Amino acid sequence: EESRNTTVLDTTTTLQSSGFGRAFFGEAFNDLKTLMRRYQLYGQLLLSVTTDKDIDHCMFTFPCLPQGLALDIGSAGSPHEIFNRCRDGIIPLIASGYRFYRGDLRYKIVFPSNVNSNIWVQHRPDRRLEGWSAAKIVNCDAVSTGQGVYNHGYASHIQITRVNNVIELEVPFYNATCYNYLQAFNASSAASSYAVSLGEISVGFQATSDDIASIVNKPVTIYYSIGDGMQFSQWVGYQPMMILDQLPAPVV
Amino acid sequence: EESRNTTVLDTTTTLQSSGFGRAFFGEAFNDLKTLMRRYQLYGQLLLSVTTDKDIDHCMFTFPCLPQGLALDIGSAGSPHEIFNRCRDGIIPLIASGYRFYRGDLRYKIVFPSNVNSNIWVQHRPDRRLEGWSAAKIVNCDAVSTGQGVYNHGYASHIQITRVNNVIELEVPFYNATCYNYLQAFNASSAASSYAVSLGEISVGFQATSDDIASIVNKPVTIYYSIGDGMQFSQWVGYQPMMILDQLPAPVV
Amino acid sequence: NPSYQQSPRHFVPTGMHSLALGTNLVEPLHALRLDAAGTTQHPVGCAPDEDMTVSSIASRYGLIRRVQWKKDHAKGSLLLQLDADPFVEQRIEGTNPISLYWFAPVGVVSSMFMQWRGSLEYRFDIIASQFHTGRLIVGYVPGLTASLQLQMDYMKLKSSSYVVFDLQESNSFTFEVPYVSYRPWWVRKYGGNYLPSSTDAPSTLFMYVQVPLIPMEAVSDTIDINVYVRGGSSFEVCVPVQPSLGLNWNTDFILRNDEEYRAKTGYAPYYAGVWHSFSLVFRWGSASDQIAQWPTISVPRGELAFLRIKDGKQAAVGQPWRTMVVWPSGHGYNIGIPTYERARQLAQHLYGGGSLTDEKANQQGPGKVSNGNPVWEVMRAPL
Amino acid sequence: MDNPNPGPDGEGEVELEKDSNVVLTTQRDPSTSIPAPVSVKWSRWTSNDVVDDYATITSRWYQIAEFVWSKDDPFDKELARLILPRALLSSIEANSDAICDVPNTIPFKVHAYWRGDMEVRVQINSNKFQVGQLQATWYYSDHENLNISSKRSVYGFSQMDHALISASASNEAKLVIPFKHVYPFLPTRIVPDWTTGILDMGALNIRVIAPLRMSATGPTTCNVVVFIKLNNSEFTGTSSGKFYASQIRA
């Protein structure tokens, strides 16, 4: 059995329990659900406009999942230095150790401040996630389907960039499942792909093609926490880890 | 009779009622009045100044009705991609299935952020709606009547664009009717046209002709919900629908 | 004047209230009413007879199928194999380029939602006199994919749930279709205009002919069977998403193929006007640096292209400007130069290796803008 | 149960429906369909004139439509688009005489405005061996809608509540239509703020869901007769009869 304990050959005395730092620091760290609610950087992108965008056209999209995105180090010339150097963060390091999840997510998208244009945000729970490839932030090209535009019935919110350039969200668990998958996802079953991400958030600017030039190559950073309903269910052990301070230094 | 039920040949057992998603998602979706209060895009327009506008001159107008406007796909070269591709939304899809309405509407007009000028908004319940043709957003030309200017006694509000570029409204039921018409409207009777829209909202900028150049071809998007007093009365079945994912893709 | 010296609040601004939330939420507004406590009222004859409610819209039969049941049908002939979802289909045989469709009220009220579950109810009105005798299976196979949709008969149907109806005197019955799936809900069939996330039905409804029709020699050999759909007592839908349906109130649809040419979005209407950094050029506004920008024409190496509008009535009118040469001005965008043959020679100069500043206003006049964003035809010629 | 003993008197029970001096009988039970609950009176809000329902004359039945329904009529087929407060008058003017000649409609000649309910009985006289089915559907304000020209089919009127008239059962269609117009009164004549579309509450329209089916020597035709009662009425605005103009022929 795993956690069996045959003969405890104890040489120790009693050690005074601090209450996971409650006695020293005034706060307990036993519950790992409340450490998961500290906001972690989810994604990081430069706004790259390809074709002439209408007011409806979504600037970028991303599938919304607590597992972390398919990790974008970046191009081999210009790497995103946090996901290159500070690999994976905390929430998929804890969600790496579980199998199922049932709950909500929070996002707090941070926009550039040079832009002024009004920003809409759609949650689209219809969208299936076709594999861990393209489980990432997609700078959208010219519109071919209803994926690429503002849509009607889905839950949206419009942040005014002139008042405050951060929209803060609560993306609900709108799946027809018991719980969703939490590791990396290869999409074996065709309906299994309805059960990975909570939905598919698309952020779009309402600017015309004359104000679209101030938008180009400005950073948009996304955060996430797990929003008080998140319950990771089945214990699955961790995979092989990589130690970060053994990564090579950029030799001059 | 319609809902008669002669011989129910039931093979089923009992299925556990979820409460319209209350058991799974923490919220019921039975009442369709509260889904109607999610804001839907009402209209979408580019500010096109034709003649030299005074401070009084209304920039645009629109008749205010829950049926949805006469749907502007756009010009054959440049279509408005949401009303082209995502046809009609939710509130006239539910209001397509009823005949009369009695209630209020909300608007939440979203202005561009490049402009700074102070914006006035008139509600004009005097205005009759002469047919479904020109039941749409009218970019106003040179002033000939009192339609084209700011007026005194009507209920107005002035949004300061420098504080927040969104004015949020509650357009009351100021008709002399029992309830108003809800399908598309051909204006048979001359007084029937007093009974379609709640009124006729006109939005106008207070800018002179030197600041009018920053206004030109900026988008103004309008929303609407139905505002807690809206009661659609007579059940009328739906018309022929069109399926959206059978619409042709833009072949490269 | 007491001085208030305590520390004040420390908020976050946001520009707008929630668009998504709609139930348990006092939403502040700017009412255009005169009374701040005023609410629209419903007197005794203006009363709402119909509660707007999914379980009252979906609980209404809508005719969905008309079935021709003749005498010469054998003891296994299929009458319908429609799917066991609320999106049962009746297509109109019309001449429109996009086909309209009839739906039951359960289908339209279920098309605005992502998911659905629960029993459906099909009412079969077998329009017959008391002298027609027949008998028909209305069965239900849980879980048929489209490859297993064929190879059916009534004998494979009898292994699943089925209902055998005796047409002798009473000539109407309601088969309440079970909800059997692996999933507590079920994702919508069509979706928005998006070809994935288009999930076929949980199961299929069949209707065969168990015992063939035996009509008397005085009554007709044929019988129509009307098939009505209702959301059952257990039918329910949950997540509100983009409706998969549109109205027929405006069936016009604009195909955006890339073969035709026009100005960029936001730079139309435009008129011929002078500009100091460039002679006339198409301008979308009266202020400086408001030139109408133009897309780059995919001209192959060794050729050239000038322009001619498809409709001269929609063009900008100074003569109505029907010809134009699109070329980079040097400020990062393509200007459209109005011409008087001269467009062909200017395209010979520019695509041949020249410039705008090489040696090789009075026609402005009224400055009429174009009719919106008119479609420009690309005429192509060899260099 | 099931003891058939016909006599010289016939077999079944005959039910009646008596009004002022009109009794019309049906062998069969009606297929009633009531699109709205019964309307409140509403003369308190917009009338100081003397208002009286003429229930001893107005609540009688009156035939306003009769039509042959042959088997030559196809599936999706209108049979009668009756505009019912108009069709009561235009049937009389189709009988080539004035409105004042009929007891049911003399207060339309005098009074200016009308609010009331309408009973409609769409009786059929099909044979027992004929097979087919009508539906009788009431639509509120047909002509104030422009996409009704595409809704007007049997798939669209089956969604709202309606009556079914099977040709086998020789069924009768009771249809209680209360007053729901936008304005709480319908003018009987040309009134200052609307002249076009007078006295138009909506349309009873009678489509075909199944056509008539029979043998080669079967009875081809099938007559349908529509009666209307005007029961919970009230008339206001006593005016001259010379301001009443004739209805549009349609």
PDB file of N, CA and C in Angstrom, chain A residues 52-55 124-128 130 142-147 150-160 163-164 166 168 174-178 191 194 208-210, chain C residues 12-20 114-115 182-188 192-199 239-243 256 262 264-267 284 293 295:
ATOM      1  N   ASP A  52      -7.016  44.254 -41.993  1.00  0.00           N
ATOM      2  CA  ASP A  52      -7.821  45.408 -41.617  1.00  0.00           C
ATOM      3  C   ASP A  52      -8.980  45.012 -40.710  1.00  0.00           C
ATOM      4  N   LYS A  53      -8.903  45.410 -39.447  1.00  0.00           N
ATOM      5  CA  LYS A  53      -9.882  44.951 -38.477  1.00  0.00           C
ATOM      6  C   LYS A  53     -11.066  45.901 -38.384  1.00  0.00           C
ATOM      7  N   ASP A  54     -12.258  45.318 -38.423  1.00  0.00           N
ATOM      8  CA  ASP A  54     -13.519  45.982 -38.162  1.00  0.00           C
ATOM      9  C   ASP A  54     -13.692  46.134 -36.650  1.00  0.00           C
ATOM     10  N   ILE A  55     -14.813  46.729 -36.250  1.00  0.00           N
ATOM     11  CA  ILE A  55     -15.095  46.948 -34.835  1.00  0.00           C
ATOM     12  C   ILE A  55     -15.455  45.635 -34.157  1.00  0.00           C
ATOM     13  N   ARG A 124     -17.052  32.364 -24.135  1.00  0.00           N
ATOM     14  CA  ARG A 124     -17.713  31.451 -25.057  1.00  0.00           C
ATOM     15  C   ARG A 124     -17.563  30.024 -24.563  1.00  0.00           C
ATOM     16  N   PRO A 125     -18.552  29.504 -23.839  1.00  0.00           N
ATOM     17  CA  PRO A 125     -18.443  28.123 -23.358  1.00  0.00           C
ATOM     18  C   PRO A 125     -18.725  27.069 -24.412  1.00  0.00           C
ATOM     19  N   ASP A 126     -19.143  27.458 -25.620  1.00  0.00           N
ATOM     20  CA  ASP A 126     -19.418  26.479 -26.669  1.00  0.00           C
ATOM     21  C   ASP A 126     -18.160  25.782 -27.144  1.00  0.00           C
ATOM     22  N   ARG A 127     -17.022  26.437 -26.993  1.00  0.00           N
ATOM     23  CA  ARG A 127     -15.842  26.078 -27.751  1.00  0.00           C
ATOM     24  C   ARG A 127     -15.166  24.850 -27.162  1.00  0.00           C
ATOM     25  N   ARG A 128     -14.891  23.870 -28.018  1.00  0.00           N
ATOM     26  CA  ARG A 128     -14.141  22.690 -27.627  1.00  0.00           C
ATOM     27  C   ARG A 128     -12.658  22.989 -27.781  1.00  0.00           C
ATOM     28  N   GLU A 130      -9.347  21.550 -29.069  1.00  0.00           N
ATOM     29  CA  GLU A 130      -8.828  20.486 -29.922  1.00  0.00           C
ATOM     30  C   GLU A 130      -7.340  20.324 -29.643  1.00  0.00           C
ATOM     31  N   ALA A 142      -7.877  37.045 -40.496  1.00  0.00           N
ATOM     32  CA  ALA A 142      -9.113  37.472 -41.143  1.00  0.00           C
ATOM     33  C   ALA A 142     -10.276  36.539 -40.816  1.00  0.00           C
ATOM     34  N   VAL A 143     -11.481  37.108 -40.802  1.00  0.00           N
ATOM     35  CA  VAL A 143     -12.646  36.414 -40.270  1.00  0.00           C
ATOM     36  C   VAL A 143     -13.200  35.439 -41.297  1.00  0.00           C
ATOM     37  N   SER A 144     -13.314  34.173 -40.900  1.00  0.00           N
ATOM     38  CA  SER A 144     -13.960  33.161 -41.726  1.00  0.00           C
ATOM     39  C   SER A 144     -15.213  32.580 -41.086  1.00  0.00           C
ATOM     40  N   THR A 145     -15.253  32.454 -39.765  1.00  0.00           N
ATOM     41  CA  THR A 145     -16.397  31.908 -39.048  1.00  0.00           C
ATOM     42  C   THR A 145     -16.865  32.917 -38.007  1.00  0.00           C
ATOM     43  N   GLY A 146     -17.800  32.502 -37.151  1.00  0.00           N
ATOM     44  CA  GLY A 146     -18.221  33.324 -36.033  1.00  0.00           C
ATOM     45  C   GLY A 146     -17.268  33.343 -34.860  1.00  0.00           C
ATOM     46  N   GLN A 147     -16.174  32.581 -34.944  1.00  0.00           N
ATOM     47  CA  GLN A 147     -15.104  32.655 -33.958  1.00  0.00           C
ATOM     48  C   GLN A 147     -14.451  34.030 -33.943  1.00  0.00           C
ATOM     49  N   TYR A 150     -17.252  39.661 -32.521  1.00  0.00           N
ATOM     50  CA  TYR A 150     -18.138  39.825 -31.379  1.00  0.00           C
ATOM     51  C   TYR A 150     -19.421  39.049 -31.637  1.00  0.00           C
ATOM     52  N   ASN A 151     -19.921  38.354 -30.624  1.00  0.00           N
ATOM     53  CA  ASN A 151     -21.161  37.615 -30.794  1.00  0.00           C
ATOM     54  C   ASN A 151     -22.192  38.101 -29.788  1.00  0.00           C
ATOM     55  N   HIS A 152     -23.434  37.678 -29.995  1.00  0.00           N
ATOM     56  CA  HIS A 152     -24.547  38.285 -29.272  1.00  0.00           C
ATOM     57  C   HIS A 152     -24.776  37.667 -27.902  1.00  0.00           C
ATOM     58  N   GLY A 153     -25.145  36.394 -27.865  1.00  0.00           N
ATOM     59  CA  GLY A 153     -25.736  35.859 -26.657  1.00  0.00           C
ATOM     60  C   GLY A 153     -24.752  35.563 -25.558  1.00  0.00           C
ATOM     61  N   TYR A 154     -23.476  35.443 -25.897  1.00  0.00           N
ATOM     62  CA  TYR A 154     -22.476  35.065 -24.917  1.00  0.00           C
ATOM     63  C   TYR A 154     -22.254  36.197 -23.931  1.00  0.00           C
ATOM     64  N   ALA A 155     -21.819  35.833 -22.732  1.00  0.00           N
ATOM     65  CA  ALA A 155     -21.623  36.808 -21.675  1.00  0.00           C
ATOM     66  C   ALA A 155     -20.397  37.657 -21.941  1.00  0.00           C
ATOM     67  N   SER A 156     -20.588  38.968 -21.933  1.00  0.00           N
ATOM     68  CA  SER A 156     -19.547  39.892 -22.337  1.00  0.00           C
ATOM     69  C   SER A 156     -19.398  40.961 -21.276  1.00  0.00           C
ATOM     70  N   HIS A 157     -18.311  41.714 -21.373  1.00  0.00           N
ATOM     71  CA  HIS A 157     -18.153  42.908 -20.559  1.00  0.00           C
ATOM     72  C   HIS A 157     -17.240  43.860 -21.302  1.00  0.00           C
ATOM     73  N   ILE A 158     -17.475  45.149 -21.142  1.00  0.00           N
ATOM     74  CA  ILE A 158     -16.740  46.165 -21.878  1.00  0.00           C
ATOM     75  C   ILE A 158     -15.997  47.013 -20.864  1.00  0.00           C
ATOM     76  N   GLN A 159     -14.681  46.896 -20.858  1.00  0.00           N
ATOM     77  CA  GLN A 159     -13.867  47.800 -20.076  1.00  0.00           C
ATOM     78  C   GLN A 159     -13.580  49.064 -20.868  1.00  0.00           C
ATOM     79  N   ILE A 160     -13.822  50.203 -20.237  1.00  0.00           N
ATOM     80  CA  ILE A 160     -13.430  51.500 -20.764  1.00  0.00           C
ATOM     81  C   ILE A 160     -11.980  51.713 -20.366  1.00  0.00           C
ATOM     82  N   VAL A 163     -11.105  54.950 -18.243  1.00  0.00           N
ATOM     83  CA  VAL A 163     -11.353  54.960 -16.806  1.00  0.00           C
ATOM     84  C   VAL A 163     -10.323  54.117 -16.077  1.00  0.00           C
ATOM     85  N   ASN A 164     -10.146  52.877 -16.522  1.00  0.00           N
ATOM     86  CA  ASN A 164      -9.223  51.944 -15.892  1.00  0.00           C
ATOM     87  C   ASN A 164      -8.919  50.867 -16.915  1.00  0.00           C
ATOM     88  N   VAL A 166      -8.003  47.768 -16.824  1.00  0.00           N
ATOM     89  CA  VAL A 166      -7.989  46.392 -16.350  1.00  0.00           C
ATOM     90  C   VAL A 166      -9.417  45.900 -16.152  1.00  0.00           C
ATOM     91  N   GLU A 168     -11.682  42.717 -14.793  1.00  0.00           N
ATOM     92  CA  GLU A 168     -11.523  41.641 -13.824  1.00  0.00           C
ATOM     93  C   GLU A 168     -12.711  40.703 -13.941  1.00  0.00           C
ATOM     94  N   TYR A 174     -19.245  26.358 -16.844  1.00  0.00           N
ATOM     95  CA  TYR A 174     -20.332  26.016 -17.753  1.00  0.00           C
ATOM     96  C   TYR A 174     -19.993  24.798 -18.593  1.00  0.00           C
ATOM     97  N   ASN A 175     -19.763  23.661 -17.951  1.00  0.00           N
ATOM     98  CA  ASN A 175     -19.571  22.427 -18.692  1.00  0.00           C
ATOM     99  C   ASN A 175     -20.674  21.455 -18.335  1.00  0.00           C
ATOM    100  N   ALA A 176     -20.936  20.528 -19.247  1.00  0.00           N
ATOM    101  CA  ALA A 176     -21.903  19.466 -19.012  1.00  0.00           C
ATOM    102  C   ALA A 176     -21.259  18.244 -18.393  1.00  0.00           C
ATOM    103  N   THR A 177     -20.180  18.428 -17.653  1.00  0.00           N
ATOM    104  CA  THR A 177     -19.413  17.313 -17.149  1.00  0.00           C
ATOM    105  C   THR A 177     -19.603  17.211 -15.651  1.00  0.00           C
ATOM    106  N   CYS A 178     -19.060  16.144 -15.076  1.00  0.00           N
ATOM    107  CA  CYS A 178     -18.880  16.134 -13.634  1.00  0.00           C
ATOM    108  C   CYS A 178     -17.780  17.100 -13.228  1.00  0.00           C
ATOM    109  N   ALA A 191     -15.681  14.115 -27.800  1.00  0.00           N
ATOM    110  CA  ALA A 191     -16.447  14.894 -26.842  1.00  0.00           C
ATOM    111  C   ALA A 191     -15.663  15.213 -25.591  1.00  0.00           C
ATOM    112  N   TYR A 194     -14.753  18.794 -25.109  1.00  0.00           N
ATOM    113  CA  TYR A 194     -15.673  19.707 -24.437  1.00  0.00           C
ATOM    114  C   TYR A 194     -15.416  19.828 -22.951  1.00  0.00           C
ATOM    115  N   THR A 208     -11.177  51.493 -34.992  1.00  0.00           N
ATOM    116  CA  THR A 208     -11.093  51.403 -36.440  1.00  0.00           C
ATOM    117  C   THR A 208      -9.647  51.212 -36.881  1.00  0.00           C
ATOM    118  N   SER A 209      -9.433  51.290 -38.193  1.00  0.00           N
ATOM    119  CA  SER A 209      -8.108  51.007 -38.737  1.00  0.00           C
ATOM    120  C   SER A 209      -7.189  52.221 -38.687  1.00  0.00           C
ATOM    121  N   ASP A 210      -7.679  53.369 -38.214  1.00  0.00           N
ATOM    122  CA  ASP A 210      -6.776  54.500 -38.017  1.00  0.00           C
ATOM    123  C   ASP A 210      -6.210  54.529 -36.604  1.00  0.00           C
TER     124      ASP A 210
ATOM    125  N   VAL C  12     -11.154  50.793  -6.765  1.00  0.00           N
ATOM    126  CA  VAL C  12     -10.824  50.573  -8.170  1.00  0.00           C
ATOM    127  C   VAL C  12     -11.907  51.223  -9.031  1.00  0.00           C
ATOM    128  N   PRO C  13     -11.560  52.037 -10.027  1.00  0.00           N
ATOM    129  CA  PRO C  13     -12.554  52.440 -11.019  1.00  0.00           C
ATOM    130  C   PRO C  13     -12.772  51.360 -12.057  1.00  0.00           C
ATOM    131  N   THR C  14     -13.994  51.289 -12.570  1.00  0.00           N
ATOM    132  CA  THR C  14     -14.276  50.559 -13.795  1.00  0.00           C
ATOM    133  C   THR C  14     -15.204  51.401 -14.637  1.00  0.00           C
ATOM    134  N   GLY C  15     -15.148  51.218 -15.944  1.00  0.00           N
ATOM    135  CA  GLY C  15     -15.908  52.119 -16.780  1.00  0.00           C
ATOM    136  C   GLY C  15     -17.378  51.814 -16.902  1.00  0.00           C
ATOM    137  N   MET C  16     -17.799  50.601 -16.582  1.00  0.00           N
ATOM    138  CA  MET C  16     -19.127  50.166 -16.973  1.00  0.00           C
ATOM    139  C   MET C  16     -19.613  49.095 -16.013  1.00  0.00           C
ATOM    140  N   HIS C  17     -20.923  49.059 -15.786  1.00  0.00           N
ATOM    141  CA  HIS C  17     -21.528  47.964 -15.047  1.00  0.00           C
ATOM    142  C   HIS C  17     -21.535  46.690 -15.878  1.00  0.00           C
ATOM    143  N   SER C  18     -22.011  45.614 -15.266  1.00  0.00           N
ATOM    144  CA  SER C  18     -21.965  44.321 -15.925  1.00  0.00           C
ATOM    145  C   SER C  18     -23.007  44.234 -17.028  1.00  0.00           C
ATOM    146  N   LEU C  19     -22.583  43.722 -18.180  1.00  0.00           N
ATOM    147  CA  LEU C  19     -23.508  43.384 -19.249  1.00  0.00           C
ATOM    148  C   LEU C  19     -24.053  41.982 -19.068  1.00  0.00           C
ATOM    149  N   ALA C  20     -23.289  41.122 -18.407  1.00  0.00           N
ATOM    150  CA  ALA C  20     -23.658  39.719 -18.328  1.00  0.00           C
ATOM    151  C   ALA C  20     -24.727  39.482 -17.278  1.00  0.00           C
ATOM    152  N   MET C 114     -26.736  26.848 -24.919  1.00  0.00           N
ATOM    153  CA  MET C 114     -25.706  25.887 -25.269  1.00  0.00           C
ATOM    154  C   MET C 114     -26.181  24.464 -25.078  1.00  0.00           C
ATOM    155  N   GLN C 115     -26.809  24.175 -23.953  1.00  0.00           N
ATOM    156  CA  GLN C 115     -27.078  22.803 -23.586  1.00  0.00           C
ATOM    157  C   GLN C 115     -28.560  22.611 -23.331  1.00  0.00           C
ATOM    158  N   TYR C 182     -24.807   9.904 -22.166  1.00  0.00           N
ATOM    159  CA  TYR C 182     -23.740   9.757 -21.190  1.00  0.00           C
ATOM    160  C   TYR C 182     -23.479  11.044 -20.443  1.00  0.00           C
ATOM    161  N   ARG C 183     -24.201  12.088 -20.776  1.00  0.00           N
ATOM    162  CA  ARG C 183     -23.905  13.442 -20.397  1.00  0.00           C
ATOM    163  C   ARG C 183     -25.162  14.005 -19.754  1.00  0.00           C
ATOM    164  N   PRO C 184     -25.054  14.737 -18.641  1.00  0.00           N
ATOM    165  CA  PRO C 184     -26.265  15.254 -17.987  1.00  0.00           C
ATOM    166  C   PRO C 184     -27.004  16.271 -18.819  1.00  0.00           C
ATOM    167  N   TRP C 185     -26.289  17.028 -19.629  1.00  0.00           N
ATOM    168  CA  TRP C 185     -26.833  17.977 -20.575  1.00  0.00           C
ATOM    169  C   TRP C 185     -26.489  17.477 -21.963  1.00  0.00           C
ATOM    170  N   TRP C 186     -26.745  18.288 -22.979  1.00  0.00           N
ATOM    171  CA  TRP C 186     -26.338  17.899 -24.319  1.00  0.00           C
ATOM    172  C   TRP C 186     -26.103  19.146 -25.142  1.00  0.00           C
ATOM    173  N   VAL C 187     -24.934  19.230 -25.772  1.00  0.00           N
ATOM    174  CA  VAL C 187     -24.552  20.422 -26.510  1.00  0.00           C
ATOM    175  C   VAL C 187     -25.399  20.561 -27.770  1.00  0.00           C
ATOM    176  N   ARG C 188     -25.817  21.801 -28.029  1.00  0.00           N
ATOM    177  CA  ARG C 188     -26.616  22.222 -29.175  1.00  0.00           C
ATOM    178  C   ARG C 188     -26.104  21.688 -30.515  1.00  0.00           C
ATOM    179  N   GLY C 192     -23.285  28.820 -33.499  1.00  0.00           N
ATOM    180  CA  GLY C 192     -23.115  29.965 -34.372  1.00  0.00           C
ATOM    181  C   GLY C 192     -22.463  29.577 -35.684  1.00  0.00           C
ATOM    182  N   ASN C 193     -22.147  30.574 -36.509  1.00  0.00           N
ATOM    183  CA  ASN C 193     -21.547  30.214 -37.787  1.00  0.00           C
ATOM    184  C   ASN C 193     -20.113  29.765 -37.543  1.00  0.00           C
ATOM    185  N   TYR C 194     -19.981  28.493 -37.179  1.00  0.00           N
ATOM    186  CA  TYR C 194     -18.751  27.917 -36.670  1.00  0.00           C
ATOM    187  C   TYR C 194     -18.900  26.410 -36.845  1.00  0.00           C
ATOM    188  N   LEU C 195     -18.130  25.841 -37.771  1.00  0.00           N
ATOM    189  CA  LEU C 195     -18.374  24.465 -38.201  1.00  0.00           C
ATOM    190  C   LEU C 195     -17.965  23.402 -37.183  1.00  0.00           C
ATOM    191  N   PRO C 196     -16.887  23.540 -36.397  1.00  0.00           N
ATOM    192  CA  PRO C 196     -16.794  22.702 -35.196  1.00  0.00           C
ATOM    193  C   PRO C 196     -17.751  23.192 -34.123  1.00  0.00           C
ATOM    194  N   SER C 197     -17.796  22.461 -33.021  1.00  0.00           N
ATOM    195  CA  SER C 197     -18.805  22.568 -31.967  1.00  0.00           C
ATOM    196  C   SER C 197     -20.211  22.407 -32.537  1.00  0.00           C
ATOM    197  N   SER C 198     -20.361  21.469 -33.481  1.00  0.00           N
ATOM    198  CA  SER C 198     -21.638  21.153 -34.105  1.00  0.00           C
ATOM    199  C   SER C 198     -21.941  19.673 -33.834  1.00  0.00           C
ATOM    200  N   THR C 199     -22.657  19.428 -32.742  1.00  0.00           N
ATOM    201  CA  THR C 199     -22.807  18.076 -32.225  1.00  0.00           C
ATOM    202  C   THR C 199     -24.158  17.476 -32.586  1.00  0.00           C
ATOM    203  N   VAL C 239     -27.269  27.015 -20.675  1.00  0.00           N
ATOM    204  CA  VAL C 239     -26.275  28.099 -20.738  1.00  0.00           C
ATOM    205  C   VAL C 239     -26.565  29.020 -21.917  1.00  0.00           C
ATOM    206  N   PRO C 240     -26.750  30.324 -21.701  1.00  0.00           N
ATOM    207  CA  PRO C 240     -27.144  31.217 -22.795  1.00  0.00           C
ATOM    208  C   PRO C 240     -25.944  31.581 -23.643  1.00  0.00           C
ATOM    209  N   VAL C 241     -25.987  31.200 -24.910  1.00  0.00           N
ATOM    210  CA  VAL C 241     -24.904  31.503 -25.831  1.00  0.00           C
ATOM    211  C   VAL C 241     -25.515  32.157 -27.054  1.00  0.00           C
ATOM    212  N   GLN C 242     -24.696  32.409 -28.069  1.00  0.00           N
ATOM    213  CA  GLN C 242     -25.172  33.005 -29.307  1.00  0.00           C
ATOM    214  C   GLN C 242     -26.222  32.116 -29.949  1.00  0.00           C
ATOM    215  N   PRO C 243     -27.366  32.664 -30.348  1.00  0.00           N
ATOM    216  CA  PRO C 243     -28.378  31.856 -31.023  1.00  0.00           C
ATOM    217  C   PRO C 243     -27.876  31.328 -32.348  1.00  0.00           C
ATOM    218  N   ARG C 256     -18.299  38.211 -48.314  1.00  0.00           N
ATOM    219  CA  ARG C 256     -17.076  38.995 -48.320  1.00  0.00           C
ATOM    220  C   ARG C 256     -15.963  38.181 -48.973  1.00  0.00           C
ATOM    221  N   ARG C 262     -11.817  47.691 -52.535  1.00  0.00           N
ATOM    222  CA  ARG C 262     -12.500  48.825 -51.927  1.00  0.00           C
ATOM    223  C   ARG C 262     -11.508  49.522 -51.013  1.00  0.00           C
ATOM    224  N   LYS C 264     -10.105  50.935 -47.259  1.00  0.00           N
ATOM    225  CA  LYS C 264     -10.004  50.298 -45.955  1.00  0.00           C
ATOM    226  C   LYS C 264     -11.149  50.741 -45.056  1.00  0.00           C
ATOM    227  N   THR C 265     -11.338  50.003 -43.967  1.00  0.00           N
ATOM    228  CA  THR C 265     -12.455  50.262 -43.072  1.00  0.00           C
ATOM    229  C   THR C 265     -12.206  51.528 -42.264  1.00  0.00           C
ATOM    230  N   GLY C 266     -13.155  52.456 -42.332  1.00  0.00           N
ATOM    231  CA  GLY C 266     -13.038  53.711 -41.631  1.00  0.00           C
ATOM    232  C   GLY C 266     -12.564  54.867 -42.478  1.00  0.00           C
ATOM    233  N   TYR C 267     -12.163  54.616 -43.721  1.00  0.00           N
ATOM    234  CA  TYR C 267     -11.701  55.664 -44.617  1.00  0.00           C
ATOM    235  C   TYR C 267     -12.709  55.980 -45.709  1.00  0.00           C
ATOM    236  N   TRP C 284     -10.876  61.324 -46.808  1.00  0.00           N
ATOM    237  CA  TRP C 284     -12.083  60.958 -46.089  1.00  0.00           C
ATOM    238  C   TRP C 284     -12.528  62.019 -45.099  1.00  0.00           C
ATOM    239  N   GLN C 293      -6.992  55.746 -47.086  1.00  0.00           N
ATOM    240  CA  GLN C 293      -5.978  54.734 -47.322  1.00  0.00           C
ATOM    241  C   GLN C 293      -6.568  53.599 -48.145  1.00  0.00           C
ATOM    242  N   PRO C 295      -5.880  49.444 -49.835  1.00  0.00           N
ATOM    243  CA  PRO C 295      -5.111  48.203 -49.714  1.00  0.00           C
ATOM    244  C   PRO C 295      -4.137  48.027 -50.869  1.00  0.00           C
TER     245      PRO C 295
END
